[PDB]
Structure formats: C-alpha cells, structure tokens
C-alpha cells in the first residue's frame, strides 16, 4: 500500500496496480467495519464539493453517503445552481472552491471540464463520471470481482456493448491488475484507440491481456464475468430502429450467457434499460451481482476519500 | 408502546392505536428534550434518502432538520435530479438506494409510486405526502390535539373542504384513536369510499365515530377542532369561478367558526391560500394552532425515524 | 466586543463600528483555529435554512461549509423547490421555518423579500445577497483589508464601476470603520442617494470620508485598494454595445492600476467577467487578493453565525 | 492571516509581512493559552526530526518543548549519531526521514546543508540556525518588540556588533514589518550585501528603513531597541587581542546605552559572553528583555510548527 | 496469526512462517490506518530502551517514531552514555533496565551482546542490527515484496554483494516464506555456513529455494528482485583498491539490471554508497523501491512492538 | 503528609522526616497503581530538563521513564550538547531553561554546580547525583527498607566502604527517619564531618543513631541491612594495588555477611564492580535486594516529580 494523499482521480491510467490495491484493501476494511457497526468518522469537519451536470442516482448518493459515514459533509452543487451557469470560468470556480472545501467531485459531460477542475484546484478532484471515463465504477467493479472470485489476476472479464466511458475504465483497471479483458462492440462502436493501446501496454506489463472482438458470442466464451452497459444513445434509434438492430445482437440474455462459465458473474454499472442491453431474466438472475457491485461504489469511494483527504500534511 | 423497528409508514390504516401512541409518546419526550436542550443524536452515521416530485417547505425541512437533530444526514433528492428522470425503474432505484441509505422518505404524486418504493426497498419507506394520504401530517395533527385538549378520545374533530389526502389521514388516525370525526365536503368532493369505510370500522372498534356531512355549518357545531385545507385545484376555477362557488361556502371564517366551542382549535396543514379556504382573521386568530401543528411535524417525524431506524437488529 | 445574539444581518447601516469589529475579531480567531486544526463545533445540532432565488457559488458554499465546520447543518432551499413557488406567502414561510431552524439566510432579488423574512421570522435572518446590499461580502472585504494593511482607519478604498449592492456595502462598512472611501461610476450609474448620505453621516462620525467621483483615473490616485464588480447588466449591451462604451472606461487594467500606490490591493467580490470590468493581467496579478478575499467569506460568516445563533438564551 | 501549510522556514526573505504576522498572532494566542493553562495538543502523533551539528541550549529545548506541548514528539538527532557521519548523502537522509517524520528542523553550519534538506525532503524543513540566518530567533525577537512596544512599524531597532546570521534575520524581518533598522559593525564585519539590499527593497516596500553605520554610539541614538550578539570568533583574538580591540568599542554598556530612549529594550539572542559584547550591568538591567525574548522562541516556534504541520491536507 | 506476546526478536530463524505473516498482516493494517489518519495509541505509558553502539538513521528513527505513534516513549541510550561504558556488565544493565522499561531494542556490534541482553532481561529484546543479522530489515523487505508482487512464495529474490548480516536475514526470512532466494558474493565473502544450511532446511520445508552463486550476472537472471548492500569494508581498499576490484564486478548498474525481469524491484537496505554497490541511475530508477522499503521499517516495527508488548498478561 | 510544591531536592538534610514520608507514601501508592495498571498521567504537557555531565543508566532512565508514565516529557541534555560546553554560565542556562521547562534534574560533578542551578532557576531543581550527595537514591533505599522490614525506625543499617555521596545520603535520611545507622570506611576514607554531625543531630532528634567504625566485621554485627558501593577510584590502584589492599578488607562476601541477622538485606546502589566491593555470591544471593532497590528509583522519583511540579499554583 502506498500514499494517495492529495491525489486527483480522473483516470486510472495514471495509477499503479499497487495504488489501486491500496484503495481496494482500504475499501474492504471499511466495508467490514460498516457491517459490524464500527464507526469511522475519519473526515470530521471536512467537506466535498459535488458538481453535477447530469441527473445521478449512484454517483450522487454513494458520494453523499460516504462523506456522512466519514463524519464530513458533501455539498450537492448542480452546475445550474452555480455561477458556472452565468459565465464564471471553470478555473475561477475551482480556485474559489479550493478556499472553502477539501476535495471536489465532478460529474460532467466533457472530460476536459474535470481535467481543468483538477488543473486549477489546489484540492483533490475526483471524476465521478465523464464522457471519457468512470474510474470509481471500475474500482467498485474490481472490488466485487476480487470479492466473488478471490482474485483478479487471470480472471476473464468480458464487456459487450458500446465501447464507452465505463468500458474504458473496465479495460484500464483490468489490465493494470493483470486480468484477462475482452471488449466486444458493434463494428463502429469501439473504445478509444488511445485506451486500447494503454490496455495493451498495461497487460504487457501486468501479465494480463486485452482483446477486442466484434462477436459477443465469441467474446463471452468461458467468461468469468460478463459486463454490459446502456447502448450508444447516439443515433437515437435514428430512422426509428437502427440503434437497436446493431446493438441488439449484443444483448445479454440467457442464450448469450449460456456460453460463459456456469459460475460467471453478470455485471452492469447501472442504470439498466431492461429489455435492451439486458433482459429481466439475466439481471434478476442468481448469477447477477449488480446490487453488490453498486453497493461497492460506497465502500470504494469511502476508501478514496479517506486516502486522498486523510493522508494530511 | 410497541416496536416499529423496520416498518414502512405509507398509510396509518395498517397501524394499531398503540403503535400510533408509541409515536406520539416518543414525540413528546423528544420535544421536551428539545426545549430543555438535551441532545439526542440517536441516529449518528445514518442516512435518509428524501425523494421529492413536488415543491415542499414543511415535508422537506421537517425531515431534513429531524435527521440533523438525530445526528444523521438527509439527502435531498429531487426526482428530476435522479436517473428516475431518465427511465430507471422505481424498483431498481429502491434496490440501489437500499445498498446506500438506512431509510427512504418519498414525496410523490401517485401513491403507487411510494408503495412500489416500499415493496422493492429493503429499508423503511416513509410517505412524506401522496395524492392518497399524508400520515406524518396526521401524526402531527393528533399530537397537537393531545397537547391542547389533554386527550383525543371523544374530541370532536371537524374537517371542512376537499375530501383529499390529508382528510383521509385525519379520518383514519382520528378513528383509530377513538375521536369523533366529521368530514364535510362539496357534494362531489368527498373522501375515497374505501377510506370512509375504514374510518367506520375503525370507530366501531375504537369507540370513536365518523360522520360525512355536506353542510359545513352543520358539521362544525360544538366542534373541538375545525380543520381545513386548500380547495380541489382540479377544475382550476374552470369557467373562471366554478371552483370558488362550490368550495367557497366551505370557507372557514369568523361566522362558520362562531358555531364551534369557544375554546375550539383552528387547524390547517398548510400551505394556506389566505382569503380562500380560510381568512386572515381566523388563521391569525388566537384560536388558530397552525404554527404549533406545523412544528409537531418535526417532533413526530423525529419519533418515527428513531423508532423505525433505531430499533436495530 | 458586544453581543449580536439574535440579530438579523440585512444591512450594515444598523451596525455599530464595534459590532463590526466583533465580527472581524471573532473571524480572525476562527481563521487561525482553522489553519492550526483546532476544531470548533460550536453550533452542534443547529440548522440554517438557506433560501436561494439565484445561482450562487460563493454565498452558497461559504455558508454551507461554515455550518459544517461549526457542527450544524445548512439546508439548501432553492425557492423554486419550496411552496413559495406555488403561492405560500413570505410571512407564512418565515413563520413555519421559525419552528424548524435556528437561523435563515436568504439570497434574493428584492431586498423587501428578505426584510419581510426578518420581520416575520422569530430567528435571525441573514441577507446573503440582495439587489440592495451584500453585507457578508463587505465583512469579508474589510477583514481582508485589515489583514493586508494592519488597519482600516484611513486606508483609501476605491470602487470603480456600477454603483450597486456591493458598492453600497463597501461604502457603508468603510465609513463605519473610518476608512477613506471613494466610489466612481458612469454618470447615471451611482449608488442610491440614501446610501451616499448614510456614508457621509458615517464618515462624519467615524472620522473617515466618502467621495463620489466619475473619473476612475481620478478616483484611484494613490489608492490603497482598487475594487470593482460586474457592470450594470441592465441595458444588456442595448443597441449591441452601449453597455460597454460607458462602463469600459471604468475597466481595471494595468494602466488604471498604474496610478494607485504600488502596494495597492486589487479586490473583486466575484464572479468576474474577464476582459470586461477587469483584465487577466490585473486579477491574476501579484497585487490581486481576490482569492484571500473570497476565502474570508467563510471565516466572517462563521463568525456571524456563531455570534447570532451562539449567544443563546 | 494566511496558510503556511507545508512551508519550509529557511530564511524570512521569502515570507510576506502578512505571513510573519500570522506566526506572531498565532504565537500570542498560544502564549496566552499557556499562561492560563489551556491545553493545545494539536499535533498529537506527529514527529519532528531535529538534526544538530553544534551544541545548542535555546534551539534544542525550545523546539523539543514545543513538540511536547503540542502533543507530538521531537527526536534529538545529533548529526554525529546519524549515518550522515559515515557518508550517507544529505539528499538520501532527507528522503528517508520524509518516510518517518512530519517535519525536520536542522541546526547546521552551512546554510546549503539545510537548503538541500528542504530540497530533497517532502516534509517541511525549518532552519533552527545556520551560518547565514536565524529566522526563528527573528520571529521571537519581533514578537517581543510587538509585545513591549505595542507595534513594530516605525520602532527604531539598532543592532551593534558582528554582521552575522542573527543580524541578517533581524534586518530582514524588521524591514518586512516596516521597522526602522540600523546595523553597526566594525568596518570589515558587515552583513552580506545580498541581505543589505534585500533589507533596502523590503523597507522601500514596507515603508520601514534600513541603515548601515560603523559608529555604535551613532547608531543607537534615540533607539527603541539596542541588540547585540557574540563577536566574530573568527580571528580568535588573533595575535592575542585583535578581536577585542575592533569589537570592544561596539560593546553594549551603560555609556553606549545612555544615548537610547530611556524606555529602550536591551535585546540579545544569547548565549552572551558577559564582559565582552555586553556587561553584567546592562544585561541584568531593568531595561534588558533577554529572558522574555528567549521565552518567545518557544511560543513563536509552537506557532510555526502548528501552522506548517497542522494546516493538513 | 499467532501470539508473539513477550517474544524476543534476535534472529528470524526461530520464527515460524505464520509468526512472520502475523507481523506482516498487522503491519499492513497499521500502515493503512496511518494513511487514513486513524490513531492507534496502543502502547500508552509504555517505554522502549534503545541501546545504540553505532551511528544510525533508519533503526534509530523508525523505532523512535514507532513508539511515538503507539502512544509510548523510546529512550535513545547511546551505549557511551550508559554505565556500560564504565564497566557495568551487560547482564546487570539488562536486569536494571527490566525494572524500568517494557522492551529493549539493541543496535550492537557483537550479536552475543544482544543475545546476552535477551538472556538476562525479563522484557522482550529486539535486535535492531548486529554483525550477524538484521531481522527488522528483512521484515520490512518482505513486506515490500508482498506489497509490490502480491505474494512472496516463488518470487525470485536475488542478493548480490557481501554475504553479511542483512543477507543472512534476507536468506532466512525468504526461505521461511517459500521464496526463491539466491545469494551471489565474491568468492571468499559468502554468508555464514550455518545460515546457508538454515536457509536450505527452510526452503526444503517451505517449498521455496536457496542458491549460492558467485556470478552476479548469473544470479540476477529473470529475477523479481535484485538486492544489494554496502561492500565488505573489511580490507578497507587494502593496498588502495583491492576492495573495489573484487566487489566492483558485483555492482548493480543498468547492465547487470538488464538481465532481470523488466518489472523487477531494486532493493537496498541503505545507507547506500552511490557509485559503489549501486549507481545513481539504478537507485534513482523507476524500478527502485528503496524509499518504500525504508518506510516499511516503521510499519513492520510498529507491528512487532504492539505484538510483543501488547499481548499483555 | 505536607506540600513539597515548588521545592528543590539537592540534599535531604533540609527535609523533615514528615516530608520524606510524604515522598515514600506517595511512592508506594504510585507503585501499587503501576502494578495494577491504573494510569496516572498527572503531569501531562509538563517537561523536565535532564542535565548530564557523566554516563548514567539508573538516574537517566528512571527519570526519563518517570516523566513518560506521568504523561510529560524528559529532555536528555548531555552538558556537552548544551552551550554550557561553549562557555554560557550556569546562572544564564538555569534562567533560560526556566522559561521553557517545569523542572530541572542535574547529574553533575560539583555539587556547587547544582546548587547554582537551584539558585538561579525559577523551577524546581533535583540533584540526580553529585559528588556530595545522592538524595533520590536514599529515597529509593529507605523505601525498600520500609517495604522489606515494615518499618525504618530502629532498623540497623550498615554501610561499609568509601564514605561517599551515597553514604552521606544513606546517613542523613536514615537519621532523619530514626534508623540506627553505622558507617565503616578505611581509615582516611570517611564521610564529610559536616554530614557526620548532621547525622548526629538528626539521630538525637529522631531518636535513631549514627556510628562511625573502621572494622567492617564490627559494623555489620546483627545488621538488618548491609550496604556497599564502589571503592574510592581516587588513587586508582595507585602503585598498582594500593586501592585494593585498603578497601578489599571492606568487601562484602559470604563471610562478612555471616555476621548480620539471617534475614538481613544486601543493598547496593549500583553499578557494582563484581569481585571488588561485592562478590557474585552475595549480590546474586537470595538476601540481595538490589533489583527491587533499583526499581524504587522510578517509584520514588515519580513521587518527587508529582509532588514538586504537581502541587501547582
């Protein structure tokens, strides 16, 4: 384990495997404490500015609850309720916020927006979701995998669907930790090529592996985990059903699922569109872990906050 | 007194008289503690998700203050700010919320919405107001009556106006507790018939009484309390004044009030439309208790929260 | 120092110089405590209702953080989320809020709105900003001046720009404290005449001075501080550039700034419109103190809250 | 007051006047707390590595006591007892120490030695004395002057003797704070010319003044303070008495002292060589404040430590 | 995990693999606590006598800081400052110390000296370094390896240089824990043969392996870790350069390092002689972990102290 | 029991019997607390400057541990590490230390050195050993005697050897407390005559007795305690064995010991020169109490410190 004191969490590519394990180990300790009722108000008096540009259930309340458990206070700052709305620059709001709060979490459209937040703020900035990446989801995701499989190295983790922000994060964290990652998207809907190569260098160094297919049935074979997310809204069923015909073959159902190991984990970052990327029978299936995975957002983010705002100097 | 640990609070019809007295007795103890400055942070580290579909002053801040006094944290979740807005199912948000918070309070349009919340959540769900019922208002209301009259059994409690959600609750709680309830509405604007019969069975068992008139002046005679609420917005002064001509005779003023006992209590759940359901002279009158009644939302809800989230196992 | 227990803070004209110094001395003590890590949860269990009518970054999070540090809880109440939106009177919401919270801060358009809040509420009401005045900004502003110059009496404080709400407050506080205040606006854009005369009587009694010019270059000569704010939006570049041609000569840049003392302080209440009232080179200049000034909103407001809600009886 | 969190304290030239006042204000608060018995264990669990190259009474025990009062622990590390002695590089010991302690104080010969410590350590490094400067002594010194004169600006502070490390610090701090500093040395024994010019720019900006004489009787005229230190050991009474004949006219005695204001302060950083730089009759005189000045090393350094290690992040 | 209450720590050969894992698991828990700011003053009121015969940076301050964090107090006892210096027997000082302190740590020349300390003291005695072994360094070393590789069993750990005290400890701990250890020394400079055979029996039982080469380039092939230390001072470059010509081929540089796995760990117990056993480019290289390894002396020794003095009876 | 608040402890001759019993009673209470694990951090935040001129094991760590147990901090100040070394006067270091610490303990050669310390310091000064006396040893010694014999009055306490500092203290305390003291030295090596007469007046008043023999075998007859110390180093076996031939007949061995009561106590202040003043067989004998006697330095000094620094005003 190593210090993360003062660190931003924008993207996991600038994290070492040991830095990620630090978060996961701390998160497991916090989770056991939570189950046995041991208090841990480690950030008493501290505050987290939460800046939101979009509706949010998971990122919103997992961060807000995490600060409550840790004894501090999260501010829910809809960007529409700030002077950002009326023109104040990002740089200037990061600067003024830095004189009031101890960390900032942003849930933003453009990743450049939270990169600028980190650039100008003198406190840690956490990306709670951007169009480019979803690092706290990946932390939760691999926490869940570690918990259910006892390990991460060499487990076969397969994502099918739109190569988006959480696929990037799934890819990056998986390859830092040595897992065998495979991503299968409709032909023009793949992860950024910068991220694919990051994934490849990561696996090369970690001894894990990345693999980019286009046949979901091919991808999931003997999988330990099958992971999906909502389809590319972009081209919003264009004509009136183009979006469906290209993503629909990538839908996780009892047949697709048939091919993975019997003890496979069904994962989904949520929110899910039932009957689209996934069917009721899979997500509500005994093999689905989406509620445990969602819960781990709280424990992993509590770990992040304590580590970046708690290692104090 | 009996345990309420883990219970939902949707509608008071599924509460016994003793379960309601448990809330009122606990609420009086909390209120005295509050007046003498005795702290009672009994829910330290606990959190309450507050889901709101409508503007709110009383339900919003009485729940938010109650969690602060009890040492925990309420999250103000405008349903527009959640992924409910973008399609996530109620069932799925109740499920994910259950992995983060310790109770949920919903302020919703359709009662079925908070019944579904209760159905799918594994933590207690409290109806902070629905089109069908307003149980926390009734708890506050009969707390106030107990405080001013020293008792509830046999006091004559008269509601005039639109047979709506708070009339239902007024009716149900009153008849569970043995009071003599009478409700007088414009002829097509009466309480649900399911609730009237609930009221009748309740009074039959409690020894109290229910009575559904249509002459407000008739209703209020020798009343201990006269209660009203805003008129049925529905038919929003239709032509340009139909809403008024039918509800206006049911307006609480110095003349209507003339008929009740001299020491009668004027009650109103708020917000009030001055000059409509009630006149300045009555609501600002010495006989009005609307500010004490509004205050008791805080004390009764503090009692509810401590009892449903505090009886822990 | 004197008691401020129970006081409203609407406008500084009804404050004595000693009452203002009480806030500043308390604010400096809190700030040193904050820098050395000494906790001060002096308002545990207390709550602050924050009513907002406009977007806000500084007023919003400086009050919300201040309550967190003091151990209590601020409620963020967008007036659109309250029953104010649906017609409930100000008087009635002040009254009901008074039964739940321990103070109210309002960020409002019409000053009469927060005067009514104070009138009807039985708890202290703090104006967090109105069209008429910005008292908490002035407290922060003169805290900053005291800190950088070691004194306030006789320092020459020059405001250039639109004679608005924060100019009023700058004027009033400055003249209560004995400073030498000068305000320079485009010819029809001057402070209220009620406030100018308040300023004049204040300076007469404090031994400070007020002076209303119309030549910014004239105003700033040998200034200790140069202060500006956003231009009168009113007449929103009317034709397509009238707003600019009249306020633009009042823009703070390296040339205007040239004339003040070399060790002058550049101040701005924020948010700033870079390239309009001020240029990047001045605001980002070594002589600018806008981030220290913004920070002092937290310390001065913490002082206000502890003093008006803490002197308890 | 401003944050000093994480700062090194090598030389006061890189400190603003406000940063120095922050230390002095905090130091006065700590001193009053100490006199009234209010505990302040603000650095519990924290540790300070003290590296010493020379014998020390004042620097040694004022830092060691300061950490005890603050609840943490100072390590007394004679550089002869460390692996520095056996060849380990400064860079490498700063690096390893950084993984164990929370700050480092060094008492060193060559200033470059503590500059390197600061360069390579990731924790704050404090110069407890070097051949070039003695910043903690100057902080104590001007604390004492503020306490006895009520102010620093414009008091006339005169140093006579060898232009050494504490004269540098006396000069720099005095000119940052606006005092009127004059330094009088034997003709080849003056302060570094880098420091004299620093002093001159400082006074130019602060409005104070520096002045370098060579006639002690000239220097001390109407002085508020007369300050001396041990003579340049260098040339250790060379022949057998050269050191004396050049510094001896600069000896502070009842005659030299005659010329200063009657209420002048006699100061000396200690240790003193009685009968050399000063006579028993002056140092033990009612006008001497050397014991109060020495005491203020504890209070000012407690302020430094709490501020650089306490502003934690 | 098993109890270590009351145990001496002289040499790891008398420790089971499970007893070592007990220290490492406890050390990781303490380290996470330290990073998140959770206090753990588990030895309040307890004291550790530290007896030193040689200069020390790492052993000195890691033990002294560890007692501070744990709430107790380490005494720095240079053996020259004790009556040992003047003839008092080891047995008698162990005996008298036993009536005052709760544990003793010795940093000694002759291992027999700390064996006698353990023999006569009735409190635990910890070898902080002897000519024969350096057990606390090995604990730190394999903590670091566990942290960076996720495991110890089967990692290939290669030491090149003088077969000294820390090589012994590296060998013993590695073979207790199942690692694949190889040691390569100049031909007459190998580990004690008692220790080599201990290593061999250990590996036989643990399933790890030991191997004693004399070609560093041979040794390091595909290594997971390459470890070195300072050269045998003995024969202090005898003629004027004999020491160099025999140890210099065993110098860790970019070429030697070339042969190990790319993700190999460079380790060194410190202090290092740059340009001798190791070059700037390796030790300051991204693959070097010497600062993390040095840090783990604090965490592992905190674990030792809490376990041998905390398991109290 | 009486107050000792603020007192110096230089020599026991200026202590009353009741003042000594105050220390012993307090010491027994502290010792029982220590054995049962009852904490007693009575000097939290207080500090003790320990000034040492000689190597020390017992005085060093018994004082340093005593301050740790009491919650404060002892500073180990080797006089070589202070500016005493470089010429600063005793008076001036006592004076400066008085502004930092709360008591001073000195371990010095010349008693005049610690008398001067007491004279100039405004905090209590404790003689931890001087050439003239060893008062804390005597306190421990008679604590031990009280514990083993249940009383002190009338027990026969015999010292054989060099009439030195601890014999003085043995003599003085014994005669204040009513014991029957006899001292037997080689003919020119007797206690100071000032002390012998002090002893005689003391015994005259206490009803105890002093007696100065020169035949050790004569002295020890029917003794309750036999006490010795190291021989006069002075004349360091001059010729090559003169020191031995005169002190050697005064050596405590099984034959000398034969003559005392069977249940006699063998005492020695330590450190011992085995085979000189005492033989292995006596000191390691069941009748020896030197480890219990050494332990009581901690308990008696804890009593002293709490009483002279704790009786605060």
CATH number, position E278: 3.40.50.1370
Residues C76 and C168 in one domain: no
Taking the C-alpha atoms of residue D150 and residue A289, their distance in angstroms, rounded to an integer, is 70
Residues A100 and A153 in one domain: no
Instruction: Using alpha carbons, select from B298, B173, B187, B291 the residue that is nearest to residue B232.
Output: B187
- Residues in chain C within 8 Å Cβ distance of D42: 36-38
Residues D130 and D270 in one domain: no
Residues F172 and F145 in one domain: yes
Nearest chain A CA: its distance from E124 CA (Å): 29
Residues C205 and C226 in one domain: yes
Is A93 in the C-facing interface, judged by CB distances under 8 Å?
Answer: yes
Residues D132 and D200 in one domain: no
Q: Are F272 and F66 in contact (CB under 8 A)?
A: no
The secondary structure of F256-267 as a DSSP string is HHHTS-TTPEEE
**Order of strands, sheet of A73-78, starting from the edge strand that comes earlier in the sequence:** A73-78, A47-52, A103-107, A125-129
Exposed/middle/buried for residue E131 (C-beta within 10 Å: 0-12, 13-18, 19+): middle
What is the SS3 assignment for A125? strand
| Residue C258 DSSP symbol | H
Residues B113 and B237 in one domain: no
Is F286 in the D-facing interface, judged by CB distances under 8 Å?
Answer: no
Residues A114 and A183 in one domain: no
Which residue matches tokens 């800190």? Answer: C147
Taking the C-alpha atoms of residue F288 and residue F266, their distance in angstroms, rounded to an integer, is 4
Beta carbons of A60 and B81 less than 8 Å apart = yes
For E38-69, b where at least 16 C-beta lie within 10 A, e where not — what string?
Answer: eeeebbebbbbbbbbbbbbbbbbbbbbbbbbb
Convert B151-197 into a string of H (helix), E (strand) and C (coil).
CCCCCEEEEECCCCHHHHHHHHHHHHCCCEEEEECCCCCCCCHHHHH
Residues A246 and A285 in one domain: yes
Taking the C-alpha atoms of residue A152 and residue A178, their distance in angstroms, rounded to an integer, is 7
- CA distances to A256, B35, B37, B152, C48 from B32, rounded to whole Å, are 62, 5, 9, 20, 22
CA dihedral (A250, A254, A259, A265) positive or negative: positive
The secondary structure of A234-263 as a DSSP string is SSTTSSSSHHHHHHGGG-B-HHHHHTS-TT
Taking the C-alpha atoms of residue D208 and residue D227, their distance in angstroms, rounded to an integer, is 18
Residue F189 neighbours by CB distance under 10 Å: 19
**DSSP β-bridge partners for residue D75:** D49
> Nearest 5°: CA angle at C152, between C150 and C157?
115
Phi-psi category of D285—alpha, beta or left, where left has phi over 0 and alpha has psi -120 to 50?
beta
| Residue E232 DSSP symbol | -
Taking the C-alpha atoms of residue D175 and residue D17, their distance in angstroms, rounded to an integer, is 9
> Which one of C32, C36, C286 makes the best mutation probe of the D interface by having the most chain D beta carbons within 10 Å?
C36
Residues A127 and A165 in one domain: no
Spacing of C-alpha F231 from chain mean position: 17
Q: Are E17 and E206 in contact (CB under 8 A)?
A: yes
Residues E89 and E152 in one domain: no
Torsion of Cα atoms, F86 then F92 then F97 then F102, to 10°? 140
* Backbone φ, ψ for residue F253 (5° rounding): -135, -175
Instruction: Using alpha carbons, select from C295, C309, C312 the residue that is nearest to residue C30.
Output: C295
Non-local CB neighbours of E149 within 8 Å, separated by 6+ positions:
E155, E224, E265
Q: Which amino acids of E are annotated as binding site, given as ranges?
A: 56-59, 83, 107, 134-137, 165, 229, 233-234, 269-270, 297
Nearest chain B CA: its distance from C120 CA (Å): 13
Spacing of C-alpha A11 from chain mean position: 10
Q: Which amino acids of B are annotated as binding site, given as ranges?
A: 56-59, 83, 107, 134-137, 165, 229, 233-234, 269-270, 297
For F117-133, b where at least 16 C-beta lie within 10 A, e where not — what string?
Answer: bbebbebbbbbbbbebb
Count of CA atoms in the C-beta half-sphere (13 A) of C117: 29
- CA distances to C74, D85, E9, E106, F56 from E80, rounded to whole Å, are 62, 17, 24, 13, 9
Taking the C-alpha atoms of residue F291 and residue B4, their distance in angstroms, rounded to an integer, is 65
Residues B148 and B285 in one domain: yes
User: B touches A (3+ CB pairs < 8 Å)?
Assistant: yes
Method: X-ray
Q: Are A29 and A299 in contact (CB under 8 A)?
A: no
Q: Are E298 and E57 in contact (CB under 8 A)?
A: no
F56 known member of a binding site = yes
Q: Let me know how long chain B is.
A: 313
How many domains are there within chain B? Answer: 2
What is the SS3 assignment for F156? strand
Angle formed by the axes of helices F290-310 and F58-69, nearest 10°: 50
* Backbone φ, ψ for residue A61 (5° rounding): -85, -25
Q: Are D10 and D118 in contact (CB under 8 A)?
A: yes
> Which one of B92, B95, B105 makes the best mutation probe of the A interface by having the most chain A beta carbons within 10 Å?
B92
The token pair at D4 is 């000093």
* Backbone φ, ψ for residue A191 (5° rounding): -60, 155
Count of CA atoms in the C-beta half-sphere (13 A) of F65: 28
CA dihedral (A7, A9, A14, A19) positive or negative: positive
Taking the C-alpha atoms of residue C184 and residue C157, their distance in angstroms, rounded to an integer, is 11
| Residue F284 DSSP symbol | T
Taking the C-alpha atoms of residue D172 and residue F276, their distance in angstroms, rounded to an integer, is 63
Taking the C-alpha atoms of residue E100 and residue E122, their distance in angstroms, rounded to an integer, is 11
- CA distances to A46, B35, B188, C30, C34 from C41, rounded to whole Å, are 12, 21, 56, 11, 11
CA dihedral (E62, E64, E65, E67) positive or negative: positive
The secondary structure of C48-106 as a DSSP string is EEEEESS--SHHHHHHHHHHHHTTSEEEEEEGGGSTTTTT--HHHHHHHHTTT-SEEEE
The token pair at C220 is 């700033």
Catalytic residue at D107? yes
Q: Are F172 and F138 in contact (CB under 8 A)?
A: yes
H-helix or E-strand containing F213?
Answer: strand F209-213
| Residue E296 DSSP symbol | H
The secondary structure of F228-242 as a DSSP string is E-----SSTTSSSSH
Taking the C-alpha atoms of residue E301 and residue E9, their distance in angstroms, rounded to an integer, is 11
Beta carbons of E81 and F273 less than 8 Å apart = no
Taking the C-alpha atoms of residue D182 and residue F159, their distance in angstroms, rounded to an integer, is 66
Instruction: Using alpha carbons, select from A96, C140, B78, A58 the residue that is nearest to residue A104.
Output: A96
- Alpha helical stretches, state H, B188-289: 193-206, 216-219, 242-247, 254-258, 280-283
- CA distances to A65, B281, C283 from D238, rounded to whole Å, are 75, 103, 58
- Alpha helical stretches, state H, chain D: 17-36, 58-69, 90-97, 111-120, 135-149, 165-176, 193-206, 216-219, 242-247, 254-258, 280-283, 290-310
- CA distances to A81, E105, F21 from C129, rounded to whole Å, are 15, 64, 72
Residue in A with minimal Cα distance to B68: A68
Catalytic residue at B229? yes
What is the SS3 assignment for C291? helix
Instruction: Using alpha carbons, select from E170, A39, A164, A312 the residue that is nearest to residue D43.
Output: A312
User: F touches A (3+ CB pairs < 8 Å)?
Assistant: no
- CA distances to B55, B290, C99, E98, F15 from B51, rounded to whole Å, are 11, 26, 23, 65, 77
- For chain C, helix (H) and strand (E) counts, in that order, are 12, 9
Q: Are E84 and F57 in contact (CB under 8 A)?
A: yes
Domain interval for residue B76: 1-136+297-312
Taking the C-alpha atoms of residue C298 and residue B253, their distance in angstroms, rounded to an integer, is 48
Taking the C-alpha atoms of residue A47 and residue A104, their distance in angstroms, rounded to an integer, is 9
The secondary structure of C200-236 as a DSSP string is HHHHHHHT-EEEEES-HHHHTTT-SEEEE-----SST
> Nearest 5°: CA angle at F68, between E118 and D125?
100
* Backbone φ, ψ for residue D252 (5° rounding): -80, 110
Q: Are F30 and F269 in contact (CB under 8 A)?
A: no
């Amino acid at each position: 384990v190593v210090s993360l004191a003062g660190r931003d969490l924008l993207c996991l590519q600038d994290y070492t495997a040991e830095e990620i394990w630090t978060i996961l180990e701390t998160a497991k300790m916090f989770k056991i404490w939570q189950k046995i009722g041991k208090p841990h108000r480690l950030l008493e008096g501290k505050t987290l500015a939460m800046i939101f540009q979009k509706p949010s259930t998971r990122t919103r309340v997992s961060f807000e609850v995490a600060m409550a458990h840790l004894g501090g206070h999260a501010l829910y700052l809809n960007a529409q309720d700030l002077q950002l709305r009326r023109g104040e620059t990002i740089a200037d709001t990061a600067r003024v916020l830095s004189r009031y709060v101890d960390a900032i979490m942003a849930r933003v459209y453009d990743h450049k927006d939270v990169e600028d937040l980190a650039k100008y703020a003198t406190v840690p900035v956490i990306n709670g979701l951007s169009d480019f990446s979803h690092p706290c989801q990946a932390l939760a995701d691999y926490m869940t995998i570690w918990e259910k499989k006892g390990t991460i190295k060499g487990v076969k983790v397969v994502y099918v669907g739109d190569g988006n922000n959480v696929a990037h994060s799934l890819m990056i964290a998986g390859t830092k930790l040595g897992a065998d990652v495979v991503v299968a998207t409709p032909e023009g809907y793949e992860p950024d090529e910068k991220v694919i190569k990051w994934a490849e260098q990561n696996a090369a160094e970690s001894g894990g592996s990345f693999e980019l297919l286009h046949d979901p049935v091919k991808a999931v074979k003997d999988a330990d985990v099958i992971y999906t997310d909502v389809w590319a809204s972009m081209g919003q069923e264009a004509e009136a059903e183009e979006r469906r015909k290209i993503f629909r073959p990538f839908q996780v159902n009892k047949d697709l699922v048939k091919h993975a190991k019997p003890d496979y984990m069904f994962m989904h970052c949520l929110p899910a569109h039932r009957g689209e990327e996934v069917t009721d029978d899979v997500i509500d299936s005994p093999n689905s872990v989406v509620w445990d995975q969602a819960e781990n957002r709280l424990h992993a983010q509590k770990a992040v906050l304590a580590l970046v705002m708690g290692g104090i100097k």
